[PDB]
Structures are given as structure tokens and as C-alpha cells.
């Protein structure tokens, strides 16, 4: 029979770097109905966002 004892100390020094590039499109919509005592309106909107 045999017994083994072991100790281990590890020093790990690590580097990392990164880039990233995002390209974002977007198409918005809107409708609106306004009402008053005597004033009524309506509105339609649309939006085109690049990024």
C-alpha cells in the first residue's frame, strides 16, 4: 500500500481584448386621434432609423 500527498500552487495571468461593430435599422409607426369640445384631428407617422 502507498499514500501520496500533493500540494499545488498555480498563478495564471491572463490577457484579453475585444472589438465589436453593430449595425442597427429601425422602422417606426404611429397613428393618433385627438378630440376636443369642437376640434377633432388625426395623424399618421412613420420613422426610418439607421444606426
Amino acid at each position: 500500500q502507498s499514500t501520496q500527498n500533493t500540494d499545488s500552487q498555480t498563478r495564471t495571468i491572463s490577457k484579453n481584448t475585444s472589438t465589436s461593430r453593430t449595425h442597427t435599422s429601425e422602422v417606426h409607426g404611429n397613428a393618433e386621434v385627438h378630440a376636443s369640445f369642437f376640434d377633432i384631428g388625426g395623424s399618421v407617422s412613420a420613422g426610418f432609423s439607421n444606426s
Binding site: T24, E26, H28, D39, S49, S51
Partner: peptide
Amino acid sequence: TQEEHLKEIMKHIVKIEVKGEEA
């Protein structure tokens, strides 16, 4: 110019909306 003044007060009666970005 009374009609023009009334139109101006009607325009004031409201909001020029907001500028929102959803990017």
C-alpha cells in the same frame, strides 16, 4: 388680424411633441 391671433392661441393650446430615439 383677429383670426390670425385666434389661430396663434389655438396653436399655443398644444404641445410640439417630444424627440425620442429607440436606436
